[PDB]
């Protein structure tokens, strides 16, 4: 009685989504480039499709969890005539303009398209036609906490990549800070927990520095308080010189130094450190 679901892409994320959906009573048809990974899901109740075409034809809702959008094009190439009237929910990560081009390709073949972005703490960003999201939300809510962002298909991966922008850059800074200290002979195991704690401290500081951040970026006014761009720029300069003397790779701290240098050179030296937003943001 529950609506059938097709899921293509049986990596770790797809495996968990199939198990979840089966436990909620949905018939799940699966397909994967290597059918061996489908075997555990078949014994849990899923049906292995004979081909991508038969997988697509088995449901009105086709969920894709692949490495990138090119994998969607390659897999569904032989199934394009079977896409008419169905909804594609692509949870794969890719460039936002790539996902927008996919919406045009989906419409060419008569399909509705929703882009998704999955965050494992789970919650999923969704973007595309709201009527399509509302039609499949009873199924999508079992995968994780749905957050509809808007009717621009590209939004889900834009938000996802911006979150990963924070994650990947922050993780890189922990590795870089550890190399900086360990260059002096300090045991990595001694300082790495401190660099980790600095992330937590940074988060809690951002839990009046956050009010400074959200207010300044939105209002466009960066009042120089306790932490100005010229003060932070001098610290960034010291980090670079320390890394240059330690023999530690420079590209990451030089990027931070580049942001503060251009922020000071633009006349925002006495303003808050948040004034680097005026250097980073989109022109005009």
Name the binding residues: 10, 13, 32-34, 37, 66-67, 74, 93, 226
Q: How many CB atoms lie within 10 A of CB 115?
A: 30
**Pick 108 or 197: Cβ nearer a second copy:** 197
Q: Which residue has the tokens 């075409």?
A: 53
Instruction: Quote the CA–CA distance of 197 and 175 in Å, as a whole number.
Output: 13
**Pick 74 or 165: Cβ nearer Cl ion:** 165
Query: What's the min distance (Å) between Cβ of 197 and a second copy?
Result: 8
Residues 151-180 that bind a second copy (CB under 8 A): 152, 154-155, 157-159, 161-180
Q: Which residue has the tokens 């022109």?
A: 283
CA 223 to chain centroid: 31
Among 35, 213, 224, 270, binds a second copy (CB under 8 A): 213
Query: What's the min distance (Å) between Cβ of 64 and a second copy?
Result: 16
Residues 28-67 that bind a second copy (CB under 8 A): 67
Residues 147-186 that bind Cl ion (CB under 5 A): 154, 158, 184
Write the Ramachandran bin of 3: left for phi over 0, alpha for psi from -120 to 50, otherwise beta. Answer: beta
Q: Which stretch binds a second copy (CB under 8 A): 44-52, 54-62, 103-111, 241-249?
A: 241-249
Among 48, 57, 198, 266, binds a second copy (CB under 8 A): 198
Instruction: Quote the CA–CA distance of 107 and 28 in Å, as a whole number.
Output: 25
Cite the annotated binding site for NADP(+) by residue number. 10, 13, 32-34, 37, 66-67, 74, 93, 226
CA 199 to chain centroid: 19
CA 167 to chain centroid: 9
Residues 248-277 that bind a second copy (CB under 8 A): 248-249, 251-256, 258-259, 273-274, 276-277
Write the Ramachandran bin of 40: left for phi over 0, alpha for psi from -120 to 50, otherwise beta. Answer: alpha
| Residue 137 contact partner, candidates a second copy, Cl ion, none, CB within 5 to 8 A by sort of partner | none
**Pick 39 or 249: Cβ nearer a second copy:** 249
Tokens of 158: 């834009």
Among 9, 52, 96, 116, binds Cl ion (CB under 5 A): 96
Kindly write out the interface string for residues 89-128 of this chain, putting x where it contacts a second copy by CB under 8 A and - elsewhere. Answer: ----xxxxx-----------------------x-------
Instruction: Quote the CA–CA distance of 276 and 217 in Å, as a whole number.
Output: 10
Query: What's the min distance (Å) between Cβ of 112 and a second copy?
Result: 22
Instruction: Quote the CA–CA distance of 76 and 69 in Å, as a whole number.
Output: 11
Q: How many CB atoms lie within 10 A of CB 283?
A: 3
Numbers of helices and strands, H then E, in the chain: 12, 8
**Pick 156 or 229: Cβ nearer Cl ion:** 156
Q: Which residues bind Cl ion (CB under 5 A)?
A: 96, 154, 158, 184
């Amino acid at each position: 009685k529950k609506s059938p679901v097709t899921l293509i892409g049986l990596g770790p994320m797809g495996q968990a989504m199939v198990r979840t959906l089966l436990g909620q009573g949905h018939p799940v048809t699966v397909w994967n480039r290597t059918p061996s990974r489908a075997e555990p899901l078949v014994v849990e109740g899923a049906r292995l499709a004979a081909s991508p075409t038969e997988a697509v034809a088995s449901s009105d809702l086709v969920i894709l969890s692949l490495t990138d959008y090119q994998a969607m094009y390659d897999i569904l190439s032989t199934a394009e005539s079977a896409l008419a009237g169905r909804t594609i929910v692509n949870l794969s990560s890719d460039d936002p303009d790539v996902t927008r081009e996919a919406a045009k390709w989906a419409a060419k073949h008569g399909a509705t398209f929703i882009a998704g972005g999955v965050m494992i703490p789970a919650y999923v960003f969704y973007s595309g036609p709201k009527s399509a999201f509302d039609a499949h939300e009873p199924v999508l809510r079992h995968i994780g906490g749905p957050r509809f962002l808007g009717e621009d298909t590209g939004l889900a991966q834009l938000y996802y990549l911006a979150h990963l922008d924070v994650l990947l850059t922050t993780l890189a800074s922990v590795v870089h800070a550890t190399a900086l200290v360990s260059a002096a002979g300090v045991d990595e195991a001694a300082f790495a927990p401190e660099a980790i704690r600095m992330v937590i401290e940074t988060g809690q500081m951002l839990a009046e520095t956050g009010l400074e951040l959200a207010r300044n970026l939105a209002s466009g006014n960066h009042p120089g308080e306790l932490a100005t761009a010229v003060m932070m720029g001098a610290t960034a300069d010291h980090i670079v010189s320390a890394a240059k003397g330690s023999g530690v790779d420079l590209v990451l701290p030089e990027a931070v130094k580049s942001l503060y240098d251009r922020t000071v050179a633009a006349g925002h030296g006495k303003d808050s450190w948040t004034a680097m937003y005026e250097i980073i943001k989109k022109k005009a």
